[PDB]
Amino acid sequence: SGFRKMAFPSGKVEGCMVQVTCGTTTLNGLWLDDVVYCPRHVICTSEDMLNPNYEDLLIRKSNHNFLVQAGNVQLRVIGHSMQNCVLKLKVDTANPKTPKYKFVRIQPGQTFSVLACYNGSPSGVYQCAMRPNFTIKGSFLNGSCGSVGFNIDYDCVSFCYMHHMELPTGVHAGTDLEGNFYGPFVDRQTAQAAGTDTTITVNVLAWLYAAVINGDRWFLNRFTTTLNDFNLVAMKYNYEPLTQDHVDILGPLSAQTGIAVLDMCASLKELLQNGMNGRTILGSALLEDEFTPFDVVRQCSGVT
Amino acid sequence: SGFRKMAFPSGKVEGCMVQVTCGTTTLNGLWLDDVVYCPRHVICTSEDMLNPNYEDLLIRKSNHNFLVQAGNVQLRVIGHSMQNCVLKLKVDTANPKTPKYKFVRIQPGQTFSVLACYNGSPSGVYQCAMRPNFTIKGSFLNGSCGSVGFNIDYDCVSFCYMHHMELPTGVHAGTDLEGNFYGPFVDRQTAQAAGTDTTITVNVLAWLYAAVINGDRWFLNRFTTTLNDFNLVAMKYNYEPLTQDHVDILGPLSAQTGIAVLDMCASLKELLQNGMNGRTILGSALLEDEFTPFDVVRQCSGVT
Numbered sequence: 001s002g003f004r005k006m007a008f009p010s011g012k013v014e015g016c017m018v019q020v021t022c023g024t025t026t027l028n029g030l031w032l033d034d035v036v037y038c039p040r041h042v043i044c045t046s047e048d049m050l051n052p053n054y055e056d057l058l059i060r061k062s063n064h065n066f067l068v069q070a071g072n073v074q075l076r077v078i079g080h081s082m083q084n085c086v087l088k089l090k091v092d093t094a095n096p097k098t099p100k101y102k103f104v105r106i107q108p109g110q111t112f113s114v115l116a117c118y119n120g121s122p123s124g125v126y127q128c129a130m131r132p133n134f135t136i137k138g139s140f141l142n143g144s145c146g147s148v149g150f151n152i153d154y155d156c157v158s159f160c161y162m163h164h165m166e167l168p169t170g171v172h173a174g175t176d177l178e179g180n181f182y183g184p185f186v187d188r189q190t191a192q193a194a195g196t197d198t199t200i201t202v203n204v205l206a207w208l209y210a211a212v213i214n215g216d217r218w219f220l221n222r223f224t225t226t227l228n229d230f231n232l233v234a235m236k237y238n239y240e241p242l243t244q245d246h247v248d249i250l251g252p253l254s255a256q257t258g259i260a261v262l263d264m265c266a267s268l269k270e271l272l273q274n275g276m277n278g279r280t281i282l283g284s285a286l287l288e289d290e291f292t293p294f295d296v297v298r299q300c301s302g303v304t
Numbered sequence: 305s306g307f308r309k310m311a312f313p314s315g316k317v318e319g320c321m322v323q324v325t326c327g328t329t330t331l332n333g334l335w336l337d338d339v340v341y342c343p344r345h346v347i348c349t350s351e352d353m354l355n356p357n358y359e360d361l362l363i364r365k366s367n368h369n370f371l372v373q374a375g376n377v378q379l380r381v382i383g384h385s386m387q388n389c390v391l392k393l394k395v396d397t398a399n400p401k402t403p404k405y406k407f408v409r410i411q412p413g414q415t416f417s418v419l420a421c422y423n424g425s426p427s428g429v430y431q432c433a434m435r436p437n438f439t440i441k442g443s444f445l446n447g448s449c450g451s452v453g454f455n456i457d458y459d460c461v462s463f464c465y466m467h468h469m470e471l472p473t474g475v476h477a478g479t480d481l482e483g484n485f486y487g488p489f490v491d492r493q494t495a496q497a498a499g500t501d502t503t504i505t506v507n508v509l510a511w512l513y514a515a516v517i518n519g520d521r522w523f524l525n526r527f528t529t530t531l532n533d534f535n536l537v538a539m540k541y542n543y544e545p546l547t548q549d550h551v552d553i554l555g556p557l558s559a560q561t562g563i564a565v566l567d568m569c570a571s572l573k574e575l576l577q578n579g580m581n582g583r584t585i586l587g588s589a590l591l592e593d594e595f596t597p598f599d600v601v602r603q604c605s606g607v608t
């Protein structure tokens with residue numbers, strides 16, 4: 001019993017982290033097979049970052065300008081190319097620790113683990129979600145760029161995020177491993193405001209199921225609702241609209257607890273309208289939305 | 305910027321996790337050098353757990369009764385002994401992945417990372433604290449026993465916890481790696497109630513400093529207080545008494561922010577007396593107490 005914000009074990013990703021230096025800019029890269037992936041802004045001076053022309057900046061860079069260090073051992077760069085907002089540095093050595101891996105582009109509301117790194121060295125691991133506004137709420141200092149987000153399915157690491165940007169509001173923006181930003185963000189030091197950070201309704205419901213499974217039941221009520229009625233309330237509280245697809249995804253947690261999804265929706269509706277009244281659910285005073293239904297099932301079943 | 309509940313990178317500990325089976329009981333063990341550490345209740349039948357005599361139960365066990373599997377490879381057990389509530393299984397092979405390590409017994413209020421494992425296989429990593437009542441609030445299903453808690457100082461893993469017990473209230477009890485329980489708990493299926501789960505005041509103050517550093521400042525007020533005045537309020541709210549040692553430990557965060565510790569105490573006093581009024585601090589609606597001053601400095605400075 002007990003329910004924690006849990007990250008994937010980071011070892012498979014720790015084995016992939018390197019340092020990339022271009023001129024005086026040092027950040028992290030991801031070494032898979034004989035390719036090192038890193039943010040293209042590694043080539044920028046702070047001057048450059050105001051209005052960078054990456055294709056023009058890259059013309060001044062050669063293979064020998066990209067210094068790639070794995071632990072205290074230098075890697076030989078034999079090629080480089082820009083794909084969207086990432087550089088791919090071809091090296092002469094396959095990473096001997098390359099795990100089975102995929103590159104996936106996640107949807108808003110999907111969760112992933114971040115291995116925060118500085119100078120190619122892991123500092124910590126934590127759980128994030130792709131927010132509905134395509135930001136993430138991370139912990140990233142200068143030098144953390146090139147840190148990656150991932151999911152693990154048994155032995156296969158699915159890389160979904162690479163860190164690039166902090167907005168002036170202290171939230172984070174990045175790319176998939178093909179170098180495409182999540183949302184409308186650009187790797188330029190310009191006016192970029194995030195949209196509404198809506199609550200991921202299906203995740204909250206998943207976490208309310210987690211709470212019931214773990215003995216926290218005070219918020220269960222005598223009510224039900226409909227998707228349309230619930231959605232009127234979601235709208236008012238800046239919750240994502242709940243779809244039948246979300247109901248279907250919650251089916252297994254419905255089955256295990258015997259609480260109909262729409263009954264749990266009616267519990268969530270009363271919590272929105274009435275607040276917590278100074279009570280907690282799984283040690284939280286607010287409604288947690290960075291556990292997916294898949295996360296709740298995984299953690300409640302002990303998947304490895 | 306941003307502040308997250310962050311675990312140590314787990315790779316060094318992943319490399320130490322094995323499966324231990326005795327009869328039909330399977331749990332986890334920690335393989336360091338040529339010793340595998342595991343909870344002594346691996347020798348119990350569910351029957352045994354009501355009033356186990358471990359010395360008597362152990363007489364019926366031989367080296368060949370302890371099945372130790374590292375991945376899909378069996379380890380040869382050449383010796384076994386009981387130290388307090390752990391078994392030490394001597395194996396014929398040193399763990400080639402043994403990190404630099406220490407065994408430390410932590411104090412209440414100290415935080416650590418847990419690598420939750422099932423059948424010697426890592427499922428997830430999360431951050432815990434030794435509670436003032438010597439419980440931890442973990443996420444542990446059947447088969448998770450022998451999972452360990454740790455801190456890392458650069459390249460040295462300090463193991464501080466091994467999971468043994470869930471209390472009927474859904475909180476967790478375990479040992480250091482010498483097999484001594486934290487608090488008054490015993491490895492027996494008996495009436496064991498936890499004491500008051502008091503809030504770790506020095507951790508809350510650390511986390512309020514983290515909040516200021518990360519732009520969350522609405523709770524800063526025009527007041528100060530004294531340790532004695534603050535402690536009257538701590539007592540009333542089941543907070544740990546604040547000592548001059550706690551003030552000294554918060555000195556570096558005081559210095560960096562320019563907020564005197566006793567001024568931050570007066571902010572914490574108003575938050576206790578007035579509540580949050582539906583506001584949040586670093587995405588939390590309650591006062592977070594599982595970051596140590598050392599954790600806040602580490603995460604705010606980017607230590608690897």
Ligand SMILES: *CC(=O)N1CCN(C(=O)c2cccs2)CC1
Pocket residue numbers: 025027041042043044045046047049140141142143144145146163164165166
């Ligand atoms: C996330 C991270 O490490 N960084 C550092 C790089 N950065 C910059 O502002 C600059 C890029 C090149 C020169 S200065 C973005 C954030």
Ligand SMILES: *CC(=O)N1CCN(C(=O)c2cccs2)CC1
Pocket residue numbers: 329331345346347348349350351353444445446447448449450467468469470
């Ligand atoms: C934490 C954990 O994995 N366990 C499983 C073992 N256990 C028992 O109740 C039994 C011990 C031996 C037979 S049954 C404690 C919790």
